[PDB]
């Protein structure tokens, strides 16, 4: 009993008649390539991608962005062609190439990258770490304005916060230095959120530091809604993620609703939904900058809970599920003696009436 | 007589768990004389070419592209002689893992 294929069979295209006149890949590698391309297409039969969670598969992206910079295609192309002509022209460069001695001025590449395709890479890192999933729930934005955050570890020491990087809570004990490029007609809002590590509410997060109505690049000049609170993961749980968000706003916005007390060491007072908070001010605020870091419990954190929050310090474990054992049988057949130990309650003799 | 010793029992090669079944780690999914089903995600291969689950979960069967190990001469030769558009396909067994890896519990509040 034959059924009928639904849509194309994979190799049905090429001609079996006259195999000798067909071009083959004599390379293992060419084959590997072709195969990996074939494994990325949406086939009509049960496939690995289907079961193993492409994570919503196709998704139409609600985009709350800053509009992409408008640049002339042809002009740019011409300029680059020229630059590469010039660079290829030199004999010095070719000498550098044949003799395997060359270096790339990494700082400049980092600058160019920040300027050009950086926003997209930062975006997909954010997608990877699920920033968008826990914040705006559906929404992707490209971080048009680069955001430079750093911490002071000492006088000469500066710990940068790149997207996804790891930082110790010791480093983060003080509010960080923040830098980005804008002229001033401008108004901005900066937000620091602890995405996980809220104790009571799985769907909610903590506001650490919220600053508002930020003129230009001036960080301190803005009115602080919520004063800086140092990172405080819990001992057991690993790697909470903290998010620095940067919104470009038009009108001056004033919120007495979102304003918090000056010391504000209560946890019920800092409880936050980035979604709701954004829904409110959605018309004026457009999210622009993003930078975030991974952070795990360290010694200094202990001081927080006791000294600031006036709490005991919660500690967690990682508990694996108990091993699965089949129903116990009255006559386990052909089973090793140690069988009887798997259903044993605790190792201690018990003499019932004796 | 001319003919002798044709008599031997069946080896019971076959496929023990079927698509959609629940398995516990170490369950044998299938057993075979030659590779018929290849091991997929979370499925270990035995030295007798039998497939067993490495994780507790649900069994799934799938068709997929076959890219042999370059240390294997024969398979690389077979792949190398193919017409340029062609791609080898084979049938795989996976286990979609059910339980979460582990949980975080509150030990003590100091």
């Amino acid at each position: 009993r034959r059924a009928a294929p639904l849509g194309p069979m994979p190799n049905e295209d090429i001609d079996v008649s006259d195999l000798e006149r067909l071009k083959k890949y004599r390379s293992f590698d060419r084959y590997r390539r072709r195969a990996e391309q074939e494994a990325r297409k949406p086939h009509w039969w049960r496939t690995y991608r289907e079961h193993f969670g492409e994570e919503s598969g196709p998704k139409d992206r609600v985009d709350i962005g800053l509009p992409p910079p408008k640049v002339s295609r042809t002009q740019q192309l011409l300029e680059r062609k020229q630059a590469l002509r010039e660079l290829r022209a030199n004999v010095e460069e070719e000498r550098a190439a044949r003799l395997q001695t060359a270096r790339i001025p990494l700082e400049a590449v980092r600058a160019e990258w920040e300027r050009t395709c950086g926003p997209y890479h930062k975006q997909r890192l954010a997608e990877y770490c699920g920033l968008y999933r826990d914040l705006f729930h559906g929404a992707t934005f490209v971080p048009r304005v680069p955001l430079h955050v750093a911490y002071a570890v000492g006088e000469d020491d500066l710990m940068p916060v790149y997207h996804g990087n790891e930082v110790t809570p010791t480093e983060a004990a003080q509010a960080p230095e923040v830098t980005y490029e804008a002229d001033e007609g401008s108004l901005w809002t900066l937000l620091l959120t602890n995405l996980d590590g809220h104790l009571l509410e799985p769907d909610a997060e903590y506001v650490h530091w919220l600053v508002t109505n930020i003129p230009g690049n001036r960080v301190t000049e803005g009115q602080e809604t919520c004063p800086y609170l140092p990172p405080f993961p819990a001992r057991g749980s690993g790697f909470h993620r903290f998010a620095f968000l940067l919104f470009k706003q038009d009108k001056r916005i004033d919120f007495s609703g979102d304003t918090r007390p000056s010391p504000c060491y209560q946890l019920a007072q800092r409880t936050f939904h980035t979604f709701d908070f954004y829904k409110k001010h959605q018309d004026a605020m457009t999210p622009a900058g993003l930078a975030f870091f991974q952070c795990r419990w360290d010694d200094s954190v202990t001081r927080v809970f006791h000294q600031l929050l006036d709490m005991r310090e919660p500690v967690f474990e990682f508990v694996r599920p108990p091993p699965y054992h089949p129903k116990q049988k009255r006559f386990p057949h052909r089973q090793p003696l140690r069988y009887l130990d798997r259903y044993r309650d605790s190792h201690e003799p018990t003499y019932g009436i004796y | 007589s001319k003919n002798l010793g044709g008599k031997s029992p069946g080896k019971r090669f076959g496929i023990k768990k079927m698509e959609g079944h629940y398995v516990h780690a170490g369950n044998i999914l299938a057993t075979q004389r030659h590779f018929r089903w290849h091991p997929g995600a979370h499925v270990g291969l035995g030295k007798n070419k039998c497939l067993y689950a490495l994780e507790e979960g649900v069994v799934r069967y799938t068709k997929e592209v076959y890219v042999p190990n370059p240390s294997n001469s024969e398979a690389v030769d077979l792949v190398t002689r193919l017409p340029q558009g062609a791609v080898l396909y084979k049938t795989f067994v996976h286990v979609v893992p059910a339980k979460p890896e582990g949980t975080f519990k509150l030990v003590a509040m100091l």
């Binding site: 059924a3 009928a4 090429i14 079996v16 195999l19 039969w45 | 077979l78 062609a86």
Partner: peptide, 19 residues
């Protein structure tokens, strides 16, 4: 499997002639 639509998906030998 013969009954299924996907039958013979892994069929190759007609592509390579080694005899």
């Amino acid at each position: 499997y013969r009954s299924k639509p996907t039958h013979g998906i892994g069929r190759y030998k007609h592509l390579v002639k080694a005899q």
